[model samples]
Target: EIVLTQSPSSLSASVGDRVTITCRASQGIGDDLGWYQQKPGKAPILLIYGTSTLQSGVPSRFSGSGSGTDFTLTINSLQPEDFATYYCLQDSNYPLTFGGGTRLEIKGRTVAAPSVFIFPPSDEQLKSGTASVVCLLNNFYPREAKVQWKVDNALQSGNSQESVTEQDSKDSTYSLSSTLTLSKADYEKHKVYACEVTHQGLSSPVTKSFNRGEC
Candidate 1:
């Protein structure tokens, strides 16, 4: 199984400009490739397949030309509708997979870092048995990031979870809250729990800490 990593992760361009997006495979994949164009509030459309062959009904301006580990999706003339998201997939083996799609924006923009915090469930349960820790992220835009949790100082992922994202009517921003339910044994062994948020607006991860002793 090979993974495709798309470059430029994101791009900002004008309508008439030409743009090229590249996808690099983890290993040589020959010519079995496909490209997809995805727009907001719409399904993805196949743009290219079999390397350079354009999919049916796709515009001639949208073309692909590459082979092996290196492939390119090129837009000869960008259109208003073309500024969406693009992804590349491998067709050479079972269990087809795609690169993390690249975003094409009309202009560059930065959003505010989420105000983050962690809240524990209860005092007795927190000090004794299992407990849940909620990591809250507020006042962030473009709600498309993961909530990471760590025990002690190491990251692990075997916990019951809850996640929610909502839009604020007042400022048009977003808020997300994700909770991790930890077992008593895990909490007893690890005194410190950490929540780190990774969002596009943040240059680095925004983190908050919760000490079990303080709880």
Candidate 2:
């Protein structure tokens, strides 16, 4: 499975603004990329599909380019009606995936990126045939965030144990702790797994990787 990671997560813009959003794939995706625009309470509208082709009726300023692992969407001279969340989708793989949405908003808000790490299981627990890996996310703004775990490049939602969210009284930031339980054998075979955090304030998801060999 190819993973797409976006950057800057969100930005402040206004009419006549020129901006670019990038989509980076974990692996080559050829020209199988598409872009979308989604506003509050409305269906996502296609902007540029198949990498570089603007959808019919889309403004001339909306364009896309790039191939393989790197692609970009450039919005030239933005319009008020164009303010929305933008996403990049890939058609190269089954169970299609998208870049975490990016938003164009007004100024006066600060969205801090989260710090992520993994807690390894103890030796005693590992000997029991299963290991639990905890993913911790802290120092982030807003309570709207999700934790994603992937084993051997594939998402394993069934292995998710529990997630806890706490808000700091001082700054109102959030902290989240989530765990994934997997067989020790699976970790040995896969060698690596990833923990990804997605937040509305982020233009892209923050991801961290842990390897069995590192243990």
Candidate 3:
């Protein structure tokens, strides 16, 4: 198992802009991937954990449901100063793993979506400039989640992928992971990599993002 955690500090992003955060796992969790969101000086919101599947008491605008290792987290709306930090959790085994903490910057204007979401497409798939995304719901929670993928900060229907996770220690932590391969053509500074995390009880919808680096 791999232990995952958020690093760096807070984030600064624009409303409607998709942001991403990397959760460094102690090791590879095989496929278990989870994500979370938190505002300044507040409790960490369980945006996602166990791959897909949103927690109870979340908003419809916020959703995350995927399959297997590939997963995602999305926020429909971007509120003022929503620019904050997020974390990811994985539970493929015992120890668990997470990427380093990431700060999100809301740059573009705000475009609203119907709900929250999450999905997966590896960097390699992203290289193709096309990918597929899917999401799965969790049991015991009795709630539905959403999944979606973004390209250079724009929303696209197909050409994305998805993955889900199983229940674990009730912590809502995840150990599942999937990646999207994108073409360098899609690479840009404002064109950032992002994820949508949704679960019950967030003050509002939130998004995460990560800056791409050389493999």
Candidate 4:
């Protein structure tokens, strides 16, 4: 089986611009490469197969080239609808492999900063002898956010888990949540719990803290 790696994990471009996304295979695979374009919440559409053969109905501007271990998917005179993700696949051997994918985005676009909130453990959880605190981040752009939990000014350990980022089809913004679970005794021992979010839209990290007694 061959592995495919795509370059420029994400790209920013404008309509009418020419862009090329490259995919390299771990081993030579001849011309058994294919390219696919996928829009959010939509099935992937094949653009090119057999390295340079354009699929039917695909725009002439969308083309593929190269062979063996290196291949390129190029779009000349990009269109507004071209802002999606591109992936490359190698089918030369068993266990077909795909590239990581490249997300094409509009340039000079406004990025939304997330609204951060921290919810304290509920009364039900306390009664069950366990506490779960939630940190929610909503309406962020670029789908990139890092969450960290802190207790008494120190970083926390394995008691936390973050949900996968969810995209809003209407605005293309993202939302996600992080949860910290601990025993009621451990939760009471900590004076404060803080959730910190780091994103490109913000100049610095945004943090929301909850007092142990808040619940």
lDDT winner between candidates 1 and 3: 1
- What are the per-residue Cα lDDT tens digits for candidate 4 across 3-116? 799998988777789999999999999988999999979999998887889989998998889977889999999887788999998889889999999988766357888899
Worst 10 residues of 3 by lDDT: 135-144
Regions of candidate 2 where Cα sits further than 4 Å from its true position: 108-215
Better of 1 and 4 by TM-score: 4
Q: What's model 2's lDDT at 81?
A: 79
Give lDDT: candidate 4, residue 125.
77
Using TM-score, give the best candidate's number: 4
Task: List model 2 lDDT by residue over 14-110, tens digit each.
Answer: 5677988888988988898999999878999999888999889898998898888999999999776777889999989887889987876543236
TM-score for candidate 2, residues paired by index: 0.51
lDDT of 3 by residue, 94-167 (tens): 55455555545434232222233334445666667754333332331212244344557776555445554432
lDDT, candidates in the order shown: 0.80, 0.80, 0.48, 0.87
- Pitting candidate 3 against candidate 4, the one with the higher TM-score is 4
* Distance from true location, Cα of 103 in model 1, Å: 5.3
Candidate 1, backbone clash total: 0
Q: Model 1's lDDT to the true fold?
A: 0.80
